[PDB]
């Protein structure tokens, strides 16, 4: 779990701990157009199918904010915290030490 970079493992752990996975940000990134040259662009009817694949191979609204985290490292932290919550008896020194860990 400490090295569940593989999102599939993060999801297996969402099932194991019982976390609702609606709010997670798995799948590869680079699919949001938004704004900026570092993100995706819109798409059109490139009927000729030119090699640049028009402006982008896609561009979507995936990654809706205010509830969903995108970086997988914080997903790992969240799942560890949920295991701590599952086995927690309410102790404060214990919870502080696991937050440290």
């Amino acid at each position: 779990h400490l090295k569940t970079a593989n999102p599939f493992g993060l999801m297996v752990w969402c099932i194991i701990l019982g976390t609702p996975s609606k709010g997670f940000g798995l799948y590869p990134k680079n699919s949001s157009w938004a704004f900026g040259r570092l993100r995706q662009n819109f798409i059109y009817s490139g009927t000729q199918v030119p090699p640049p694949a028009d402006a982008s191979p896609g561009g979507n609204f995936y990654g809706g904010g205010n509830a969903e985290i995108l970086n997988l490292d914080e997903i790992r932290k969240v799942l560890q915290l949920r295991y701590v919550a599952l086995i927690s008896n309410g102790s404060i020194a214990y919870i502080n030490r696991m937050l440290r860990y």
């Binding site: 709010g23 205010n66 509830a67 985290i69 914080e74 969240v78 919550a85 927690s88």
Partner: protein, 50 residues
């Protein structure tokens, strides 16, 4: 922070200036339905706090 957070059976977290945790992260941890936070029944705990 004065620290006491006066009250009974209820407290809160405090985090964020250190780890650059995402606001999306904090909002997710602040949702009681998800139930990822270590909680005792009969304590309202809000994470929020930066």
């Amino acid at each position: 922070i004065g620290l006491p957070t006066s009250g009974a059976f209820k407290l809160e977290y405090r985090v964020g200036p250190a780890l650059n945790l995402s606001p999306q992260l904090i909002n997710l941890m602040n949702d009681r339905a998800v139930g990822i936070m270590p909680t005792c029944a009969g304590c309202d705990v809000k994470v929020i706090q930066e």
